[PDB]
Amino acid sequence: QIVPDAATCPACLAEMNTPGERRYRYPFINCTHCGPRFTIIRAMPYDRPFTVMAAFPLCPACDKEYRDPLDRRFHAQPVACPECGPYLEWVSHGEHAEQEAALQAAIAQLKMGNIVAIKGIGGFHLACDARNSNAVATLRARKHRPAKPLAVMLPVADGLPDAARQLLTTPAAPIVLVDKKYVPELCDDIAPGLNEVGVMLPANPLQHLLLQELQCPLVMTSGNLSGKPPAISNEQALEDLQGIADGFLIHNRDIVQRMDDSVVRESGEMLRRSRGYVPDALALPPGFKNVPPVLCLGADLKNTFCLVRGEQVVLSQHLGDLSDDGIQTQWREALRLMQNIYNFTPQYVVHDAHPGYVSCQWASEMNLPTQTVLHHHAHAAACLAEHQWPLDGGDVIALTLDGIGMGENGALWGGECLRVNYRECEHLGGLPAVALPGGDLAAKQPWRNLLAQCLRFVPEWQNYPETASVAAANWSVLARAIERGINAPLASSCGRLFDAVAAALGCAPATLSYEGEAACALEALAASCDGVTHPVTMPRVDNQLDLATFWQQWLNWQAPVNQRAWAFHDALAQGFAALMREQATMRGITTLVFSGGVIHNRLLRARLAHYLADFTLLFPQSLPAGDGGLSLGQGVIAAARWLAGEV
């Protein structure tokens, strides 16, 4: 029974700070209670000969500790000291150092405002002084990441709320999203236009040495290139990061598994589940038992896979976007080790109903019986699973809010009201389906969605100040592609509705640099408002929200932009609450489920919980609301159809 990778413990930290200890200032100190696990194992059993540490025979001082039953390092599989262990190496445009001098060159570079690649437990990070405006602009410029927020490493948790401090200091040592007023020391280019910052504490010996020296916050972001899987070997770091890093702090212990930092909110809500949680298994809900081995391929974005057997499920670490160049290698190594750890051999494969997905191509290469699950059915089921809804617990009404998933009959869904149990998904209503002009471009340029909404719902849209940039363009070639159905598929996407509103308000750049950027900006804007009396609504017309009425009231209700953003969330929540109410009540349903990437929105949650106080409300918490949780939903639906003896 192997455990997730564990933050360095107090006792090892104390040993590493104590002059005259053999392991004094040694960056690879670990013991039976802490250190790398999943990231250093080649095969089972967990035993030094089958880890990355086979290469380093123990000196005798270490071997006496590893073998002594009453010793903290008894069978510490990756134990070492300066005599027999891995050592640090510094590489900078010509220059070379090792061990302690390697550490000092990295610190001197960080102190002068340079960017250093640092080798971690499960990848490589890029670091620099988080208070240094020039360093941070340079890092963003070199990595072409003009907006996306950067995680920051702090030396200690002092001054953070209690609930943050308590999460930050667990073995898992996650990034924890914290209000940015707690951390005034960070320059303004850390999370521009957002309200929260991701902070973490040192969790490995090398990070402790660095932060003990620097006594200041450090950007500590992933060592990759957009479109590329993160490097896990020295030469792939050297190759990948040379345009970016001014120097490299690497070492000669191999990483064999990609393992990103995990990311939670202070409230405990999981956004990314990797380092420190993988590979822990999860109990399935009551009634699921004797389930055959099922491999669930998850989603094409923010991918995780899932192994289902017996009365448990095991989720992989975050593996990213599956359409990326060589991401299949890492996926496949995670799958090998996971199957070796649990002695797992799949009898069935489950994957998404979208036939253009990479994951559905991989699934047909496996010579197993395969089955398909609707994207939004799976969202809803991951959420019921996580709240321990019983196999036979009854129907719920689900609100599934996201970007785009394939729905029934080739339709693109993302704002749906559903009747849901673990076997069935009936679509009840939701947003109107509205063109995505330019297909994939619709997610990158919010103004296209504003245009598609205006064309369908706003008479004389050209006359509103909020449509000015749109109207000054020759939008009418795009309007004709839309009429004729040329790369302008219909989608009831709630994510594309956020984008239309954000473009109307002008709160995002015209072209976006990351998925969801316009929606986060809109939500960060709405959250500075404490609530307003306003006349904006989204009425119900048969079983869909009436956006003609919404845009007419919204475009004609002048108010500060935060109050306009707040009013949008409120009308949307209210409008969905009215739909879910009619559907639940007239069927005798008393429990409501919410899932999909948009449900990560705090204001929209708070608003829906406000309108739906007459119901039991079920929201994601220990698993991501979005695509990170989808493999689990696939799993419980396949298990449930199986348990019912479905052919």
Ligand X SMILES: NC(=O)OP(=O)(O)OC[C@H]1O[C@@H](n2cnc3c(N)ncnc32)[C@H](O)[C@@H]1O
What residue ranges bind ligand X (CB under 6 A)?
149, 151, 175, 177, 191, 194, 196-198, 221-222, 224, 226, 263, 271-272
Q: Which is nearer to ligand X, 144 or 332 (CB)?
A: 144
What pairs with residue 303 in β-bridges? 320
Q: What is the DSSP string of 124-145?
A: EEEEEETT-HHHHHHHHHHTT-
Of the residues 240, 402, 416, 517, which one makes contact with Zn ion according to CB under 5 A: 402
- Which range touches Zn ion (CB under 5 A), out of 47-55, 178-186, 397-405, 424-432? 397-405
Q: Which is nearer to ligand X, 271 or 315 (CB)?
A: 271
Q: Which is nearer to Mg ion, 159 or 535 (CB)?
A: 159
Q: Which does 31 bind (CB under 5 to 8 A by kind): Mg ion, Zn ion, ligand X, none?
A: Zn ion
Q: Which does 224 bind (CB under 5 to 8 A by kind): Mg ion, Zn ion, ligand X, none?
A: ligand X
Count other C-beta atoms under 10 Å from residue 365's C-beta: 8
Q: Which is nearer to ligand X, 403 or 429 (CB)?
A: 403
Q: For 430-488, where are the alpha helices, taking DSSP H only?
A: 447-457, 468-472, 476-484
In the complex, the smallest distance separating the C-beta of residue 201 from ligand X, rounded to whole angstroms, is 15
Q: Which is nearer to Mg ion, 165 or 423 (CB)?
A: 165
What is the CA 564 to chain-centroid distance, rounded?
28
Sheet holding 152-153, edge to edge: 95-98, 88-92, 247-251, 116-119, 124-129, 218-222, 152-153, 196-200, 175-179, 263-265, 270-272
Q: Which does 159 bind (CB under 5 to 8 A by kind): Mg ion, ligand X, Zn ion, none?
A: Mg ion
- Kindly provide the residue ranges of all beta strands, DSSP E only, lying in 570-613, ordered along the sequence: 591-595
Using CA atoms, how far apart are residues 150 and 142, in angstroms rounded to an integer?
14
Q: Which does 386 bind (CB under 5 to 8 A by kind): ligand X, Mg ion, Zn ion, none?
A: none
In the complex, the smallest distance separating the C-beta of residue 268 from ligand X, rounded to whole angstroms, is 15
Q: Which is nearer to Zn ion, 35 or 122 (CB)?
A: 35
Contact of 279 with 193, CB cutoff 8 Å: no
Q: Which does 241 bind (CB under 5 to 8 A by kind): Zn ion, Mg ion, ligand X, none?
A: none
Structure tokens at 624: 């991501």
Site size for Zn ion, by CB under 5 A? 12
User: Is residue 34 a contact residue for Zn ion (CB under 5 A)?
Assistant: yes
- Which range touches Zn ion (CB under 5 A), out of 73-81, 159-167, 481-489, 501-509? 73-81
Q: Look at residue 226 and give its three-state secondary structure.
A: coil
In the complex, the smallest distance separating the C-beta of residue 182 from Mg ion, rounded to whole angstroms, is 5
Question: Which residue type, as a one-letter code, is found at position 286?
Answer: P
Q: Which does 195 bind (CB under 5 to 8 A by kind): Mg ion, ligand X, Zn ion, none?
A: none
- Which range touches Zn ion (CB under 5 A), out of 81-89, 335-343, 532-540, 583-591? 81-89
User: Is residue 83 a contact residue for Zn ion (CB under 5 A)?
Assistant: yes
In the complex, the smallest distance separating the C-beta of residue 179 from Mg ion, rounded to whole angstroms, is 10
Q: What is the DSSP string of 256-318?
A: -S--PPPEEETT--EEE--TTTTT-EEEPPTT--SEEEEEE---SSSB--EEEEETEEEEPPP
Question: Would you tell me the crossing angle of helices 517-527 and 494-505 to the nearest 10 degrees?
Answer: 70
Using CA atoms, how far apart are residues 72 and 142, in angstroms rounded to an integer?
44
User: Is residue 31 a contact residue for Zn ion (CB under 5 A)?
Assistant: yes
Q: Which residues are within 8 A (CB) of 503 and not within 5 positions of it... i.e. 6 or more apart? A: 446, 447, 449, 450, 470, 518
Task: Give the containing element (helix H, strand E) for 152.
Answer: strand 152-153
Q: Which is nearer to Zn ion, 62 or 264 (CB)?
A: 62
Of the residues 159, 227, 268, 369, which one makes contact with Mg ion according to CB under 5 A: 159
Q: Which is nearer to ligand X, 123 or 346 (CB)?
A: 123
Site string for Mg ion, 173-212 (x = CB under 5 A): ---------x------------------------------
Pairing type for strands 412-420 and 490-493 reads parallel
Task: Give the containing element (helix H, strand E) for 575.
Answer: helix 561-585
Of the residues 4, 5, 7, 12, which one makes contact with Zn ion according to CB under 5 A: 12
Pairing type for strands 116-119 and 124-129 reads antiparallel
Q: Which is nearer to ligand X, 49 or 161 (CB)?
A: 161
Using CA atoms, how far apart are residues 3 and 14, in angstroms rounded to an integer?
23
Q: Which is nearer to ligand X, 39 or 274 (CB)?
A: 274
Contact of 198 with 175, CB cutoff 8 Å: yes
What single DSSP character describes residue 247?
Answer: E
User: Is residue 9 a contact residue for Zn ion (CB under 5 A)?
Assistant: yes
Q: Which is nearer to Mg ion, 217 or 516 (CB)?
A: 217
- Which range touches Zn ion (CB under 5 A), out of 7-15, 380-388, 442-450, 479-487? 7-15
Q: For binding to Zn ion (CB under 5 A), which residues are involved?
A: 9, 12, 31, 33-34, 59, 62, 81, 83-84, 402, 627
Q: For binding to Mg ion (CB under 5 A), which residues are involved?
A: 159, 182
